[PDB]
Amino acid sequence: GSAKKGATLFKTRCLQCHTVEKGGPHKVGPNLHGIFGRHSGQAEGYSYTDANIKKNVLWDENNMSEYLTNPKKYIPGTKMAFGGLKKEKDRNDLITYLKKACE
Amino acid sequence: TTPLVHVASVEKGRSYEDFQKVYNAIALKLREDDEYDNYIGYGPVLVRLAWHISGTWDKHDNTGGSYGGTYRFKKEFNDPSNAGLQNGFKFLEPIHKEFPWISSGDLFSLGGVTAVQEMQGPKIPWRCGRVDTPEDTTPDNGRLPDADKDAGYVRTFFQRLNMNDREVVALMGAHALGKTHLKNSGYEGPWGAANNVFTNEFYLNLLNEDWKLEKNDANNEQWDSKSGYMMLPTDYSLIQDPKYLSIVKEYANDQDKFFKDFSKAFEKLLENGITFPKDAPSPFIFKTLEEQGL
Numbered sequence: 001g002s003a004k005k006g007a008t009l010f011k012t013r014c015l016q017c018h019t020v021e022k023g024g025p026h027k028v029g030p031n032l033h034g035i036f037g038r039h040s041g042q043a044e045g046y047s048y049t050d051a052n053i054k055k056n057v058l059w060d061e062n063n064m065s066e067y068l069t070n071p072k073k074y075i076p077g078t079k080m081a082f083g084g085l086k087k088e089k090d091r092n093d094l095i096t097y098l099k100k101a102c103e
Numbered sequence: 104t105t106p107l108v109h110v111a112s113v114e115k116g117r118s119y120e121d122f123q124k125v126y127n128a129i130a131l132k133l134r135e136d137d138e139y140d141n142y143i144g145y146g147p148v149l150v151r152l153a154w155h156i157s158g159t160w161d162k163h164d165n166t167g168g169s170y171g172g173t174y175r176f177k178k179e180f181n182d183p184s185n186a187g188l189q190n191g192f193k194f195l196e197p198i199h200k201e202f203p204w205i206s207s208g209d210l211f212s213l214g215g216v217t218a219v220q221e222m223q224g225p226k227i228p229w230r231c232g233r234v235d236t237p238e239d240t241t242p243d244n245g246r247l248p249d250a251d252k253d254a255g256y257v258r259t260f261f262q263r264l265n266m267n268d269r270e271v272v273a274l275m276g277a278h279a280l281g282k283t284h285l286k287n288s289g290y291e292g293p294w295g296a297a298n299n300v301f302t303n304e305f306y307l308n309l310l311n312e313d314w315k316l317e318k319n320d321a322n323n324e325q326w327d328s329k330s331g332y333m334m335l336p337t338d339y340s341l342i343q344d345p346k347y348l349s350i351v352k353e354y355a356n357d358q359d360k361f362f363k364d365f366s367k368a369f370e371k372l373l374e375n376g377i378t379f380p381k382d383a384p385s386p387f388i389f390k391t392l393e394e395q396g397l
């Protein structure tokens with residue numbers, strides 16, 4: 001979807017905890033640069049719950065969308081405190097944005 | 104004469120199901136207008152409205168409290184410690200037009216119950232029967248707490264609501280939700296990172312962050328952590344009181360516990376001052392949108 005939309009959704013719902021720029025600093029959440037194509041729990045010098053590491057999934061736009069719908073259902077024990085995006089557009093709009101922002 | 108007696112009266116032949124419908128409306132709309140406040144949603148504000156309409160109670164003469172839905176009168180509506188709740192009032196006027204039978208008092212509280220459950224908090228038994236009361240029952244402004252105080256003002260402000268130390272520490276975990284808005288109250292910032300999902304972040308932040316006191320732009324002082332959060336005086340005071348501090352540690356350690364004390368307290372908060380005849384229905388447990396396929 002729309003990547004201008006995804007952008008505000010990210011600034012509004014993910015930004016408090018995460019950066020996307022390269023080198024970007026971890027916050028509550030890991031720096032999300034080069035997320036896609038990496039395995040869950042790999043960002044460097046960020047401490048992940050064993051749960052995020054032991055799930056080891058490659059982040060592809062697809063498993064990523066199941067995740068955002070409900071982070072605790074996906075990776076129980078995860079400590080990311082997000083309720084989830086219940087709206088497909090939102091998910092589209094965001095992912096698309098991310099796709100592009102985390103290059 | 105003794106205090107006033109407020110008997111809960113069920114709305115003429117309504118029942119759970121009639122009330123699960125109201126929830127659904129509220130619940131959905133929280134799903135729909137999700138852009139509010141930089142995408143925090145209407146969650147935090149509805150739980151804050153729930154608290155404010157109930158927090159005027161005075162156990163000595165039993166005035167104030169949720170019963171009367173008096174927040175709808177200007178006097179109350181305009182109380183300066185009520186700034187920002189108009190946003191919560193508007194969000195439910197629509198839904199009220201949809202269900203004009205439910206009383207104001209039953210709507211403002213059901214609303215906070217929905218928001219907690221909808222944000223993944225614990226289940227909160229709830230009861231109906233609040234009845235609307237004349238403009239004359241409107242509590243004078245000033246029965247709600249100040250932020251700029253310490254453990255001891257807190258302990259005492261709460262004996263008036265009839266709450267103990269554990270109930271006061273549990274209630275405060277609600278500070279995991281939303282943030283402070285300088286235009287509303289002189290303070291600014293969020294307590295944490297997941298402002299719209301209900302956890303015990305409030306307590307881990309309190310004890311794991313590094314707080315420094317500082318002045319905001321409104322010219323008030325607050326505690327800021329390097330991480331971008333803030334704590335009000337009254338929140339910080341929870342770790343400076345030896346007694347508040349061990350409840351805070353319990354909770355940072357065990358969410359279930361927090362989840363259980365909070366639900367017990369929040370509901371106690373919402374039912375204060377109300378007498379339920381022995382014929383009223385057992386408190387209701389509503390289902391979430393998730394539990395209903397949504």
Ligand code: HEC
Binds near residue numbers: 039077078
């Ligand atoms: C805190 C309040 C957060 C919010 C809001 C969002 N994220 Fe999050 N994220 C956070 C934490 C603490 C963690 C690690 C959790 C753990 O259990 O260790 C994460 C993790 C992610 C991941 C996985 C990272 C990886 O596997 O390397 C992703 C892909 C991610 N977060 C993205 C994301 C999005 C898209 C958000 C909003 C819509 C979002 N996060 C919110 C902290 C927080």
Ligand code: HEM
Binds near residue numbers: 275
């Ligand atoms: C000592 C008692 C308390 C004090 C001084 C206090 C103070 C405050 C202040 C100053 C704000 C921010 C207002 C704004 O800018 O909109 C706030 C927000 C809030 N309060 Fe508290 N509070 C107290 C107890 C509670 C309790 C007991 C609960 C709930 C069960 C509660 C729930 C909330 C929530 C959910 C918010 C966020 C609202 C939003 O995001 O709009 N507070 N509180």
